[PDB]
Design a protein around this ligand. Structure first.
Ligand code: SAH
Ligand code: ZN
Ligand code: ZN
Length: 794
C-alpha cells in the first residue's frame, strides 16, 4: 500500500492458500490451553527490513472476559484498546465478525460486536464512529490519551538562572495560567501558623465498660504566581514544571481552627501572602477563587453558579493572627428530560435530579400509598400512580390510555429518562445461582424495571440500590442486569458511591447502574466533593476476582470539608422522647452553611417533622443512662435497678457464668451471662428479661465486636450511620441516639442526614415518615449524578 523507510505494507497475503484482508478477523491459538481462542482484527499487513512477514492485531475481548463472564453471549465480542504487532505465521484461521449496529428505529424495538468495553471501569460504550493502510482504533485511542495526559508548556516567558518561566501550561485537558488557582494534596505545603497536636470505673457498677477495650484534609488551594521549569538538552524540561503559589487559608487553617469556623461557608477562604513551591505533577485540578467584592453577582449566586468556586473577603496575617482587608494585588486586574421514576418513594432521587436542572419527573409509580402521597406533595406537576409497577405496565400493554382513575399512562416516546430503586429481596448472601433462582430473577422487580427500559427505550437509565446489589449471589444479580442492558443495545456501567462524599453527614454506600441509549454519551460517575472517613469510602467491587473501580479520580482528598452531625442539626430545638408536634417554630437561625442551604434564605419559621418515636419506659431509661461523652453506647450502662412507671422494674443483670475469653473483672466479678461463655452449649434458661443492660448484648458480644454502637449517641464531630427505615437503638447499627438529648433522632434530623431541604414534605404516621426518609436517595447524591448526565446533554 505504501513503503515507509523501514517497513513495506501490503494489502493482502496468502496464508496456506487462503486470502486474508485488511478489515478481516483472525484467530490465534493461545499457548495456555485453558484460554479462549485469541481473536483479532487485522489492521495492517507488512514486511519489515528484517524479512519477517507481519500483521497488526487489534484484539477483541470475548464476552466471558468481561464483567459479564459466563452470562454473556458466546458469539458477542467487544472492542478493547488492546493491540500489537504479530507474526503472520501465528494466525490459525480467518473468522467472520459482524458489526451489529443499533437499528435506526431503535426507540420502537420494545461472531458479532456492538460495543467498546473499558476493562478498568466496566463501561460498555458505543464504538467510536471516526473513520480513516494501518487504521487501528486501539492505537488511535492510546495516542489521544497520552497526548491528553502529559504536561506541556503552552507559553514560555523568559529564562532566569537556568529556568524558563512560563505563563501557561497544561495536563489532562486543563489549561493553567498565571493567576489561576490549583488544587493540591494536603501535604503539598504547610501553613506558617503553628498547630500543636491535640479514668477508672467501678466494674460492678459498670460491668460492660471493659468491652470498650478520621476524614483526611480537603485540598490545599493556592493562586499561581509564577511557573518555571528546568531545561534538558537546551530545551524545556516538561517533566519539571513547578509552581510558586500564594497560599490560601481555609477558616479551619487559621488560629480559629474548626471550633472557631463552624458557621463559615464551606467555600470561603482567606487570602495570604505566604508562598509555596509545588511540582506541577502534584496539581490535582483547577479551581476558581474570586475576591468577593469584584463579583458581578451575589456570593450565593456566584457560589451556586458553578463547581470549584471559592471566594474570600479578607486576608489573614499569620504573624499578628489578625484579618485585614486583602491587598490590592489579590484582586483581579437546556431542555429537561421527561422522566419516569419507578419505585419513586417520597422522591429523594427525583428531587436531586430536579435540583440538577436536567429532568422533569412527569410520572412516578409508588405502590405504597403514604410514599405516593408524599411524592405528590412535593411534585404538583407529576402524575403519581399509586400502583404496583407490574400492573401499570400490563395496563400499557393492554392498550389502555388511562388507568381507572383517569390518570394518563406514559407511552413509548413520552419517557426520555427512566430512573428508580427496585427493592431486591431474596437474593442476599452468596450461594450460587441455581436453576430456580433464574426464574426468581426473571420475576423480580429489578427485571420489571428492565422491562420498562426495554419497552420505553429511554435516552438515559438509572438504577439505584443497596451497595450489596453488586455482590448478591456472587454478583450474578449485577451480571444479569448488565447482560440485559447489553442485550438491548444500551451503553452501560456500574459503580458504588458514598453519599458522605457529596455533602451529607452520613455513611451511605449505594450501588448505581447507569445506561445510555446508542446515540448518547454514557455519563461518568461524579468526582467526590467532600472529604470523608477513609474506612467508609471503599468503593471498589470485585466480580469473579476481577477488581472494578469507577472513573473517580479523587481517592484521597477533595474540595470541601466533611459535613458533621453538628453541621447537620445543631440549630434544631430540644425535644423529648415521643415528641409528636409536627409543626413547631425553629426558634433560632441557621448556624452552619449546611443548615443555611437546607433552610433557605426566605423568611421561614415553621419546622416540620421534628418528632421522634415514643420509646417504651425501659428503652427510655436506658437512653437517659447513656453518657454524653463522645462514643458512648450500651457498654457504658450502669447495672442498676430503675423504677419504671406503673410499678415495673428495669432489673440488674446477673453474671453467673465464667467468660473463659474475657476473664474476671477488677472487682472479682464474673462476666458471662450464659453457659456458652464457658465454652459449653447454651443454657435454655440463660435469657434474662427486663434488665437495664440488655441481656443479649453480652450474650453474643464477643462474636460481634461487642455490638459497638448499639444504644450509641451520635457525635457532634462525627456522622450518622446509614439512615435506615426505622431507627432502633438495638438494630445492628443502633447509633441513633441524639448527641445530648435522651431520645432517638427525629424524622427531620433523619431527613437532614439525607440532605432533604427543610421544605421537603413527608406523609403518614411517624413510622411512615421514617420509612420514606430512610428509603430515599439523598438529594445531594442524586444531584451530583444528575450533573454528570447534564454533561452528556451538551
Ligand atoms: N411493585 C412495586 N411497584 C411500585 N413501587 C414499589 C413496588 N414495590 C415496592 N415499591 C416501592 O419502592 C420504593 C423503594 S425505595 C425508593 C426511594 C426513592 N428512590 C427515593 O429517593 O425516595 C418504596 O417506596 C416501596 O414502597
Ligand atoms: Zn493498534
Ligand atoms: Zn449462650
Amino acid at each position: 500500500m505504501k513503503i515507509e523507510e523501514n517497513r513495506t505494507y501490503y494489502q493482502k497475503v496468502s496464508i496456506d492458500e487462503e486470502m486474508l484482508e485488511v478489515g478481516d478477523c483472525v484467530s490465534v491459538i493461545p499457548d495456555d490451553s485453558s484460554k479462549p481462542l485469541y481473536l483479532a482484527r487485522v489492521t495492517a499487513l507488512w514486511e519489515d527490513k528484517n524479512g519477517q512477514m507481519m500483521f497488526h492485531a487489534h484484539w477483541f475481548c470475548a464476552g466471558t472476559d468481561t464483567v459479564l463472564g459466563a452470562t454473556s453471549d458466546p458469539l458477542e465480542l467487544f472492542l478493547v484498546g488492546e493491540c500489537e504487532n504479530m507474526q503472520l505465521s501465528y494466525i490459525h484461521s480467518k473468522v467472520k465478525v459482524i458489526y451489529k449496529a443499533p437499528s435506526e428505529n431503535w426507540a420502537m424495538e420494545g461472531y458479532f460486536f456492538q460495543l467498546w468495553y473499558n476493562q478498568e471501569y466496566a463501561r460498555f460504550e458505543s464504538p467510536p464512529k471516526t473513520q480513516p493502510h494501518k487504521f487501528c482504533l486501539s492505537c488511535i485511542r492510546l495516542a489521544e490519551l497520552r497526548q491528553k495526559e502529559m504536561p506541556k508548556v503552552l507559553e514560555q516567558i523568559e529564562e532566569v538562572d537556568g529556568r524558563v518561566y512560563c505563563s501557561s501550561i497544561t495536563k489532562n485537558g486543563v489549561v493553567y495560567r498565571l493567576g489561576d488557582s490549583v488544587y493540591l494534596p494536603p501535604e503539598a505545603f504547610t501553613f506558617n501558623i503553628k498547630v500543636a497536636s491535640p479514668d477508672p470505673v467501678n466494674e460492678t457498677l459498670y460491668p460492660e465498660h471493659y468491652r470498650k477495650y478520621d476524614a483526611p484534609e480537603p485540598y490545599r488551594i493556592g493562586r499561581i504566581k509564577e511557573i518555571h521549569c528546568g531545561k534538558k538538552k537546551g530545551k524545556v524540561n516538561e517533566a519539571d514544571i513547578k509552581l510558586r503559589l500564594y497560599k490560601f487559608y481555609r477558616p479551619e487553617n487559621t488560629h480559629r481552627s474548626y471550633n472557631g469556623s463552624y458557621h463559615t461557608d464551606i467555600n470561603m477562604l482567606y487570602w495570604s501572602d505566604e508562598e509555596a513551591v509545588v511540582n506541577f505533577s502534584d496539581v490535582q485540578g483547577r479551581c476558581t477563587v474570586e475576591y468577593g467584592e469584584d463579583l458581578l453577582e451575589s456570593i450565593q449566586d456566584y457560589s451556586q453558579g458553578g463547581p470549584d468556586r471559592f471566594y474570600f473577603l479578607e486576608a489573614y496575617n499569620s504573624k499578628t493572627k489578625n484579618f485585614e482587608d486583602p491587598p490590592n494585588h489579590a484582586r483581579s486586574p437546556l431542555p429537561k428530560l421527561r422522566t419516569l421514576d419507578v419505585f419513586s418513594g417520597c422522591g429523594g432521587l427525583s428531587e436531586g435530579f430536579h435540583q440538577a436542572g436536567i429532568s422533569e419527573t412527569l410520572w412516578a409509580i409508588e405502590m405504597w400509598d403514604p410514599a405516593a402521597q408524599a411524592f405528590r406533595l412535593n411534585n404538583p406537576g407529576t402524575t403519581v400512580f399509586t400502583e404496583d409497577c407490574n400492573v401499570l405496565l400490563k395496563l400499557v400493554m393492554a392498550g389502555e390510555v388511562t388507568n381507572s382513575l383517569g390518570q394518563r399512562l406514559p407511552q413509548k416516546g413520552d419517557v426520555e429518562m427512566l430512573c428508580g430503586g427496585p427493592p431486591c429481596q431474596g437474593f442476599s448472601g452468596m450461594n450460587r445461582f441455581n436453576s430456580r433462582t433464574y426464574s426468581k430473577f426473571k420475576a423480580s422487580l429489578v427485571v420489571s424495571f428492565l422491562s420498562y427500559c426495554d419497552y420505553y427505550r429511554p435516552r438515559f437509565f438509572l438504577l439505584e440500590n443497596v451497595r450489596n446489589f453488586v455482590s448478591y449471589r456472587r454478583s450474578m444479580v449485577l451480571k444479569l442486569t448488565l447482560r440485559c442492558l447489553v442485550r438491548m443495545g444500551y451503553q452501560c456501567t456500574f459503580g458504588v458511591l458514598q453519599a458522605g462524599q457529596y455533602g451529607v453527614a452520613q455513611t451511605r454506600r449505594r450501588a448505581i447502574i447507569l445506561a445510555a441509549a446508542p446515540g448518547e454519551k454514557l455519563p461518568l460517575f461524579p468526582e467526590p466533593l467532600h472529604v470523608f472517613a477513609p474506612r467508609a469510602c471503599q468503593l471498589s467491587v470485585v466480580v469473579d476476582d476481577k477488581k472494578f473501580v469507577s472513573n473517580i479520580t479523587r481517592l484521597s482528598s477533595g474540595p470541601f470539608r466533611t459535613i458533621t452531625v453538628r453541621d447537620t442539626m445543631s440549630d434544631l430545638p430540644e425535644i423529648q422522647n415521643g415528641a409528636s408536634n409536627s409543626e413547631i417554630p425553629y426558634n433560632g437561625e441557621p448556624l452552619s452553611w449546611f443548615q443555611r442551604q437546607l433552610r433557605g434564605s426566605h423568611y421561614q419559621p415553621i419546622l416540620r417533622d421534628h418528632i421522634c418515636k415514643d420509646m417504651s419506659p425501659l428503652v427510655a431509661a436506658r437512653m437517659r443512662h447513656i453518657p454524653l461523652f463522645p462514643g458512648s453506647d450500651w457498654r457504658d450502662l450502669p447495672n442498676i435497678q430503675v423504677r419504671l412507671g406503673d410499678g415495673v422494674i428495669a432489673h440488674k443483670l446477673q453474671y453467673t457464668f465464667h467468660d473463659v475469653k474475657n476473664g474476671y473483672s477488677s472487682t472479682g466479678a464474673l462476666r458471662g451471662v450464659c453457659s456458652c461463655a464457658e465454652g459449653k452449649a447454651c443454657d435454655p434458661e440463660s435469657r434474662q428479661f427486663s434488665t437495664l443492660i440488655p441481656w443479649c448484648l453480652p450474650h453474643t458480644g464477643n462474636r460481634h465486636n461487642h455490638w459497638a454502637g448499639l444504644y450509641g449517641r451520635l457525635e457532634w464531630d462525627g456522622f450518622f450511620s446509614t439512615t435506615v427505615t426505622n431507627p432502633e437503638p438495638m438494630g445492628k447499627q443502633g447509633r441513633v441516639l441524639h448527641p445530648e438529648q435522651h431520645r432517638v433522632v427525629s424524622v427531620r434530623e433523619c431527613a437532614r442526614s439525607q440532605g432533604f431541604p427543610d421544605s421537603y414534605r413527608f406523609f403518614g404516621n411517624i413510622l411512615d415518615r421514617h420509612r420514606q426518609v430512610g428509603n430515599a436517595v439523598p438529594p445531594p447524591l442524586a444531584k451530583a449524578i444528575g450533573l454528570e448526565i447534564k454533561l452528556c446533554l451538551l
